[PDB]
């Protein structure tokens, strides 16, 4: 709750919210690919 | 028997791959001081030099990714270097981790080029001064080229580390097998092994820098 | 008058020719022995202390070089300098030139002097040209410009930054700079 | 390097256990070796 | 090839996603190069 | 601390909570860091010792495979 | 090493010949003052 | 049986394709030697391009080895 | 960044002026010089020099024989014994000189003199091809 | 180099016959400590030290087994 | 708070002097040495440390590491220090 | 306090010119990469 | 059977053809090194051509891999 | 049967011949880089020749792929 | 039967030999780019030699294809 | 039978070796282009060497075709 | 049986891939000769790059030999 | 039988290795063209080196043909 | 039997890999020609590097022949 939002999320906010957006879209695509790969096996 | 070094490790039944993968950052201590020990001095100099190398060629929109790219290279380099110690499991030899490092970043940069920049993004699928009877065909080429960009990335690491490690191990076998036959032959094979280990150090650092550089080039072409 | 009109473009020219030896910092050969000493004067006297200054510097310098062990061969552009320095330094003399001074010196003159400086068969290790640098309508100063050989410009380490150079292209370049520096100096002396 | 010689208690326990340890290593060999070699024959 | 055993993939993806996107980045964010004094 | 106690009660007096074990590990890292790394004129030993422990841990999980390559039989 | 160097010609001779060829191909309107501004007069001795 | 046999033959054939990356890396670093001996002030940038070229060439090489194992163990 | 000093023994066309690119016909081939060009020093052969100005406009000269020097400091010195504009030359005289030079070539028999005739030939040929 | 035999000849030697009564003295001391229970009063510092000297002498036993089989890695049999 | 001027006196890069001094009172100076040899012999004798290709790749990387240290170590130490002292001097000039 | 006891915050206070412009450059390294 | 066996052999043979793209990419980026150390002011345009050449060379390489899978899984 | 099997093997062998066009295209565009960094004013004409060379090289490559399909589906 | 099968395999192997003409044509026209950017006044004669080189290289290539059909249909 | 089949396969394999002469002829005439655009006065002698190089390279090529027929018809 | 036979064939095919490293090492040290005869003052650095290039090229070569033994003895 | 058949196949495979000497001779005499058009006064010595290079390259080629006959007739 | 047959086939395939050393030696001595015609005063050192390059290239070639005999007689 505390010191997790303090030392982990305040510094990473400018990146997780604005810079890494398409990175998150890509992680969605990657997760879908990995799900389909592990499924066809 | 031979690929045993690339099987997911377990200790007492637990997945030690977690510890192995999370350990590298423990080797980059940080401090608020102005004048600190030799370790942090050298590491900050290295990160300064790496950021100067990787990020200078970008405009500001790309330079926003400086944290991500320098962290990428610092993670991969220490992972590969820690893979060289004896009896160690190198998580970069796994296709899983490398695909998960490649597909996110590359997809993110291609989408970033596709959200803004959209005209130039669809235009770069065609080289500029291409003559007319090749404008359609070439597009397919570029298209499939793009579609192969991420997988290539992943493989270019997963193979190059994996192969590398196998090689050393094999020569290891060789020298052991010749330890009971010809002692000078054992020594010469051990010399081959030493040269190969030096090559492996260099190729670990180079593969880290290459993964980073190619993600950087995709970023630059899509910002 | 016309002389100082032609001297400005010729000064730009002849100083651009030397920009290489300045940006490359050719240090000159400190080991080589043979030297070629050119002196620029005219054929007409009664013009002041021009020829006297040229001859005094040339004979002083050749004396110092032959005292240091280096053999010097003297070339005199102009009848005046040849006359005034022949008496004491005739043994050390390579070739002389006349009919300079009546007409304004041109580039053909420099080409001819350079030809007879190369076809003379005297492979000089280093050289110097002594002329009267025009400073103003009142003042002139005796200057000594250097002339490098092929082996010294080739052996110079900064010339390793210059690409596509071998013995042939440096040979052509050194010959043409010899001609250029002679033209520039001639134009500086007639003013 | 100046001598920092073992303390007398070291001499005591170290020496007694050294003697018993080497002797017991010999007897452990002579205990495990015969069964070892008969199983060497039993290799087939 | 053990790399092909697609049943052990998550345990390789998940910690990496941390190390590459949280812990190493948090360690760089604490690496600051102040400006030079006068 | 240990190296002084000779009673089992200490083992019951210490904490065994998640935050507790996290704190213990953190105190350990800082003790090692302050002793061998975080000094000027520090030595390489401060790192090679960590690397040696890493090799020991990596040999520990690699023993299950190595036991199939034993050279003798007893 | 071009042909004229193998014949023994210095670069000075090459420059003379090429410049004279360009000069002779000048239109007569400029040719006179051109070949005056570049003609030689030194004598060898 | 015939399938394991042909898998061996196919792996050998597939691994032949590393010759191209061998020669391509040779060419890259040879041209790096030349381009450096030509303008040794751009060394940094030169080396950058060197690595890049290497990265792509060996990339193709790894692809070959990839198919090799794809044939030897995957199927 | 390019300081170009195209100069004749009696005329100056540029002096430290900033142009974007120049093409020169060196004895070892033609090439284009731009900013930061690798440092070179070369001797020229009769032919066209095309100076591309920063305004995108090009000034075409014809040089007979000189020396180009590209320095570490982006300074380019182009010293040409005979630099002329293209309207300053005619085509008939050049053609006549070329053909009479070829005739004398098939006539002349001494080595150095033959080389001289061939140099005249190449100058006149580069000249005619530069004109039209 | 030669310091090796120096320290070994002063320290790594079997018990002299004058020390075997000393030896039984020490052994009776340890078993007396076990008899009373004073080992519980031993701080884990000296306890760990004794454990280490015990591990060292057990290693001496294993080295003796090594000298018994005239080979090192396992039984040549 | 300032930093101490030295570390912890490790021997052979792997074992701190504390161990040698702690075994000294009860097995002397050759105490730890003979303990280590005994443990190594019991290790590679009971086949708890199997000898295999990994043994020789370990020896290879250990040789490379020890040579790398003994050769490029003093240089890295002095480089790190000089970085520090240049920083200090630049600050004390800007003071 | 001598500079070996100093924290980057203390340096930024005693020499306010060294403060990184966290407004003109919001993302790491908080300065132009050429200066970096 | 014989068909799966020959499909393996044919995939290996087909993948051999990536060697050409390996060597071609090596040559492209080596010549880029040289052309840059020659005239480092045209860098931008140079790199443009570099990529273009790469694009075509690796294109052929992918064609090879294409036939590989065409033989391994398609038919 | 044996004929479908050999058709697969022959298609793989035939497709190997694309390596030559890969390397030839690499060489063409590498030499284009060089020739451009040499005389960047003839760029247009250079590129013309570039394409021409490409056209012929890849032409041979396509011939190879042509025989590939000629073996895989035609006969 | 086995003969038609081996004829397919032999045709594929034989057609591999077009790679050499692919690479040779690439080299010819790349060197043409360079030689043109170096003396653009001899263009005509250069192109003449270009074609000549091409003619011979592709000649060898056709020889390969010749044997291909010689094996596929002739016998 | 198996012998005629293997003779076909061996002829195809043997004819592969013409690729080297294809590439070698390409290189020879490409370097001729360059060496001519360099010093167009030695043209005659240049061409002489050109032919000579060609003669040897294609010589090796013919050797390959020689073995081809040696396998296809001789034995 | 058929498996040992195909293992031999696959090892031979796999070892073919050392040709690329042979040619790449040839190119590296040839370009080293040239780059040295160009600016013999950078010799040290040149040789450094030489070795580096060599290291990578022969690396690929060893990979090939690696698969060779992987097929001959491993499986 | 199977042995004569495989001897044919092995001879064809072995003769493939003449491609390298074809390309190497091409490169040698192409570089001779260039080095001559560069400095036509060292012609004699140049040609000496030319022959030497040729001698070694074709040497390897003959080795290949050597193994060819070693397989076709010797055993 | 099938094993001697496949040993022949594997030896031929393995010997193919000498082509790379043929071409690499060709390139080395061709670049030696050029680098000598460039700066004929460093001849000695040039030749030194020449031999060195040769040594490594042919080294790879011998490796190939090594595997050849390893397959033909050893096992």
From Swiss-Prot, chain C:
It is found in: Mitochondrion inner membrane. It is a peripheral membrane protein. One of its GO terms (molecular function) is proton-transporting ATP synthase activity, rotational mechanism. GO terms for cellular component: membrane; mitochondrial inner membrane; mitochondrial matrix; mitochondrion; proton-transporting ATP synthase complex. The modification N6-succinyllysine is found at residues 59, 98. The modification N6-acetyllysine is found at residues 59, 98, 141. The modification Phosphoserine is found at residue 90. Isoform Heart is expressed specifically in the heart and skeletal muscle, which require rapid energy supply. Isoform Liver is expressed in the brain, liver and kidney. Isoform Heart and Isoform Liver are expressed in the skin, intestine, stomach and aorta. GO terms for biological process: ATP biosynthetic process; oxidative phosphorylation; proton motive force-driven ATP synthesis; proton motive force-driven mitochondrial ATP synthesis. Keywords: Acetylation, ATP synthesis, CF(1), Hydrogen ion transport, Ion transport, Membrane, Mitochondrion, Mitochondrion inner membrane, Phosphoprotein, Transit peptide, Transport. Belongs to the ATPase gamma chain family. This is ATP synthase F(1) complex subunit gamma, mitochondrial. It comes from Homo sapiens. The gene is ATP5F1C.
Swiss-Prot record, chains H, M, N, O, P, Q, R, S:
Keywords: CF(0), Hydrogen ion transport, Ion transport, Lipid-binding, Membrane, Methylation, Mitochondrion, Transit peptide, Transmembrane, Transmembrane helix, Transport. The modification N6,N6,N6-trimethyllysine is found at residue 43. The record marks 58 as: Reversibly protonated during proton transport. The keyword Membrane applies. Trimethylated by ATPSCKMT at Lys-43. Methylation is required for proper incorporation of the C subunit into the ATP synthase complex and mitochondrial respiration. It is a multi-pass membrane protein. Its main location: mitochondrion. GO terms for cellular component: mitochondrial inner membrane; mitochondrion; proton-transporting ATP synthase complex; proton-transporting two-sector ATPase complex, proton-transporting domain. Homooctamer; the c-ring consists of eight c subunits forming a circle, and each subunit adopts a hairpin shape. Component of the ATP synthase complex composed at least of ATP5F1A/subunit alpha, ATP5F1B/subunit beta, ATP5MC1/subunit c (homooctomer), MT-ATP6/subunit a, MT-ATP8/subunit 8, ATP5ME/subunit e, ATP5MF/subunit f, ATP5MG/subunit g, ATP5MK/subunit k, ATP5MJ/subunit j, ATP5F1C/subunit gamma, ATP5F1D/subunit delta, ATP5F1E/subunit epsilon, ATP5PF/subunit F6, ATP5PB/subunit b, ATP5PD/subunit d, ATP5PO/subunit OSCP. Belongs to the ATPase C chain family. This is ATP synthase F(0) complex subunit C1, mitochondrial. It comes from Homo sapiens.
UniProtKB/Swiss-Prot annotation, chain I:
GO terms for molecular function: proton-transporting ATP synthase activity, rotational mechanism; structural molecule activity. The modification N6-acetyllysine is found at residues 100, 129. One of its GO terms (biological process) is mitochondrial proton-transporting ATP synthase complex assembly. Keywords: Acetylation, ATP synthesis, CF(1), Disease variant, Hydrogen ion transport, Ion transport, Membrane, Mitochondrion, Mitochondrion inner membrane, Primary mitochondrial disease, Transit peptide, Transport. GO terms for cellular component: mitochondrial inner membrane; mitochondrial matrix; mitochondrion; proton-transporting ATP synthase complex. Belongs to the ATPase epsilon chain family. It is linked to Mitochondrial complex V deficiency, nuclear type 5: A mitochondrial disorder characterized by childhood onset of episodic metabolic decompensation featuring lactic acidosis and hyperammonemia accompanied by ketoacidosis or hypoglycemia. Chronic manifestations include developmental delay, easy fatiguability, and 3-methylglutaconic aciduria. The transmission pattern of MC5DN5 is consistent with autosomal recessive inheritance. This is ATP synthase F(1) complex subunit delta, mitochondrial. The gene is ATP5F1D. The chain holds residues 37 to 168 of 168 of the full protein.
Curated annotation (Swiss-Prot), chain L:
It comes from the Eukaryota. The modification N6-succinyllysine is found at residues 19, 24. It is found in: Mitochondrion; Mitochondrion inner membrane. The modification N6-acetyllysine is found at residues 19, 24. Belongs to the ATPase d subunit family. Component of the ATP synthase complex composed at least of ATP5F1A/subunit alpha, ATP5F1B/subunit beta, ATP5MC1/subunit c (homooctomer), MT-ATP6/subunit a, MT-ATP8/subunit 8, ATP5ME/subunit e, ATP5MF/subunit f, ATP5MG/subunit g, ATP5MK/subunit k, ATP5MJ/subunit j, ATP5F1C/subunit gamma, ATP5F1D/subunit delta, ATP5F1E/subunit epsilon, ATP5PF/subunit F6, ATP5PB/subunit b, ATP5PD/subunit d, ATP5PO/subunit OSCP. Subunit d, of the mitochondrial membrane ATP synthase complex (F(1)F(0) ATP synthase or Complex V) that produces ATP from ADP in the presence of a proton gradient across the membrane which is generated by electron transport complexes of the respiratory chain. ATP synthase complex consist of a soluble F(1) head domain - the catalytic core - and a membrane F(1) domain - the membrane proton channel. These two domains are linked by a central stalk rotating inside the F(1) region and a stationary peripheral stalk. This is ATP synthase peripheral stalk subunit d, mitochondrial. The chain holds residues 126 to 161 of 161 of the full protein.
């Amino acid at each position: 709750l505390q010191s997790i939002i303090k030392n982990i999320w305040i510094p990473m906010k400018p990146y997780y919210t604005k810079v890494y957006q398409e990175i998150w879209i890509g992680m969605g695509l990657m997760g879908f690919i990995v799900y389909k790969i592990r499924a066809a096996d | 028997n031979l690929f045993a070094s690339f099987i997911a490790p377990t200790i007492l039944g637990l997945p030690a791959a977690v510890l192995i993968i999370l350990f590298p950052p423990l080797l980059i201590p940080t401090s608020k001081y102005l004048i600190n020990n030799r370790l942090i001095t050298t590491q900050q100099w290295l990160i300064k030099l790496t950021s100067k190398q990787m990020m200078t060629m970008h405009n500001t929109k790309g330079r926003t990714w400086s944290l991500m790219l320098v962290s990428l290279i610092i993670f991969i380099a220490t992972t590969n270097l820690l893979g060289l110690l004896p009896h160690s499991f190198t998580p970069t030899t796994q296709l899983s981790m490398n695909l998960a490092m490649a597909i996110p970043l590359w997809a993110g940069t291609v989408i970033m080029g596709f959200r803004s920049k959209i005209k130039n993004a669809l235009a770069h699928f065609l080289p500029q001064g291409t003559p007319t009877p090749l404008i359609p065909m070439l597009v397919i080429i570029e298209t499939i080229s793009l579609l192969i960009q991420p997988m290539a990335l992943a493989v270019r690491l997963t193979a190059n580390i994996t192969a590398g490690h196998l090689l050393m191990h094999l020569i290891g076998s060789a020298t052991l097998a010749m330890s009971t036959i010809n002692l000078p032959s054992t020594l010469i094979i051990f010399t081959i092994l030493i040269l190969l280990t030096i090559l492996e150090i260099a190729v670990a650092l180079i593969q880290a820098y290459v993964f980073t550089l190619l993600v950087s080039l995709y970023l630059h072409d899509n910002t | 008058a016309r002389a100082e009109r032609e001297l400005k473009p010729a000064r730009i020219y002849g100083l651009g020719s030397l920009a290489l030896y300045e940006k490359a910092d050719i240090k000159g050969p400190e080991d080589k022995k043979k030297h070629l000493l050119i002196g620029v004067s005219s054929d007409r006297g009664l013009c002041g202390a021009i020829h006297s200054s040229i001859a005094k510097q040339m004979k002083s310098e050749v004396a110092t070089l032959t005292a240091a062990g280096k053999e010097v061969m003297l070339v005199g552009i102009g009848d005046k300098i040849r006359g005034i320095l022949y008496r004491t330094h005739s043994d050390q003399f390579l070739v002389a030139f006349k009919e300079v001074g009546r007409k304004p010196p041109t580039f053909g003159d420099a080409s001819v002097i350079a030809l007879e400086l190369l076809n003379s068969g005297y492979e000089f290790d280093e050289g110097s040209i002594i002329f009267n640098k025009f400073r103003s309508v009142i003042s002139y100063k005796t200057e000594e410009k250097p002339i490098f050989s092929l082996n010294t410009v080739a052996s110079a380490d900064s010339m390793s930054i210059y690409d596509d150079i071998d013995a042939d292209v440096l040979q052509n370049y050194q010959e043409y700079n010899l001609a250029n520096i002679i033209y520039y100096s001639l134009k500086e002396s007639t003013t | 390097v100046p001598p920092v010689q073992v303390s007398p208690l070291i001499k005591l326990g170290r020496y007694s256990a050294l003697f018993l340890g080497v002797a017991y290593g010999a007897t452990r060999y002579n205990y495990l070796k015969p069964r070892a070699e008969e199983e060497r024959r039993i290799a087939a | 090839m053990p790399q092909l055993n697609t049943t052990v993939w998550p345990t390789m993806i998940t910690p990496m996603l941390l190390t590459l996107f949280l812990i190493t980045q948090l360690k760089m964010l604490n690496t600051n190069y102040h400006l030079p004094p006068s | 601390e240990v190296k002084l106690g000779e009673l089992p009660s200490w083992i019951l007096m210490r904490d065994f909570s998640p935050s507790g074990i996290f704190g213990a590990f953190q105190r350990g890292y800082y003790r090692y860091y302050n002793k061998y790394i975080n000094v000027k004129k520090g030595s390489i030993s401060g790192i090679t010792m960590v690397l040696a422990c890493y090799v020991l841990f990596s040999y520990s999980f690699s023993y299950k495979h190595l036991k199939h390559e034993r050279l003798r039989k007893y | 090493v071009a042909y004229w160097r193998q014949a023994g010609l210095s670069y000075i001779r090459y420059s003379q010949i090429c410049a004279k060829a360009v000069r002779d191909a000048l239109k007569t309107e400029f040719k006179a003052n051109a070949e005056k501004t570049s003609g030689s007069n030194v004598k060898i001795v | 049986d015939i399938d394991t046999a042909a898998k061996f033959i196919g792996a050998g054939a597939a691994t032949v394709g590393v010759a191209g990356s061998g020669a391509g890396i040779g060419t890259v670093f040879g041209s790096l030697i030349i381009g450096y001996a030509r303008n040794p002030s751009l060394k940094q940038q030169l080396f950058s391009y060197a690595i890049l070229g290497f990265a792509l060439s060996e990339a193709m090489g790894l692809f070959c080895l990839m198919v090799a194992f794809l044939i030897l163990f995957a199927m | 960044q390019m300081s170009f000093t195209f100069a004749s023994p009696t005329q100056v066309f540029f002096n430290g002026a900033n142009v974007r690119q120049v093409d020169v016909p060196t004895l070892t081939g033609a090439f284009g010089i731009l900013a930061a060009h690798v440092p070179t020093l070369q001797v020229l052969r009769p032919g066209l020099v095309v100076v591309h100005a920063e305004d995108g406009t090009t000034s075409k000269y014809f040089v007979s024989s000189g020396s180009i020097a590209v320095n570490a400091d982006s300074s380019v010195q182009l010293l040409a014994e005979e630099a002329v504009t293209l309207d300053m030359l005619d085509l008939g005289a050049a053609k006549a000189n070329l053909e009479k030079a070829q005739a004398e070539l098939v006539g002349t028999a001494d080595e150095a003199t033959r080389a001289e005739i061939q140099i005249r030939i190449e100058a006149n040929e580069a000249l005619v091809k530069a004109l039209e | 180099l030669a310091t090796f035999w120096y320290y070994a000849k002063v320290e790594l030697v079997p018990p002299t016959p004058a020390e075997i009564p000393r030896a039984i003295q020490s052994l009776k001391k340890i078993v007396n400590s076990a008899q009373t229970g004073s080992f519980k009063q031993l701080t884990v510092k000296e306890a760990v030290l004794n454990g280490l000297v015990a591990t060292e002498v057990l290693m001496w036993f294993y080295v003796g087994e090594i000298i018994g089989k005239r080979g090192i890695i396992g039984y040549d049999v | 708070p300032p930093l101490p001027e030295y570390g912890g006196k490790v021997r052979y890069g792997l074992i701190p002097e504390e161990f040698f001094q702690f075994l000294y009172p009860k097995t002397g100076v050759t105490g730890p040495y003979v303990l280590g040899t005994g443990l190594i012999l019991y290790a590679l004798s009971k086949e708890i440390y199997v000898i295999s290709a990994e043994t020789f790749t370990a020896l290879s990387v250990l040789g490379v590491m020890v040579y790398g240290i003994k050769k490029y170590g003093p240089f890295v130490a002095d480089f790190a220090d000089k970085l520090n002292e240049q920083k200090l001097a630049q600050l004390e000039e800007a003071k | 306090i001598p500079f070996d006891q100093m924290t980057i915050e203390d340096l930024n206070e005693a020499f306010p010119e060294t403060k990184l412009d966290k407004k003109k450059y919001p993302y790491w390294p908080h300065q132009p990469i050429e200066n970096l």
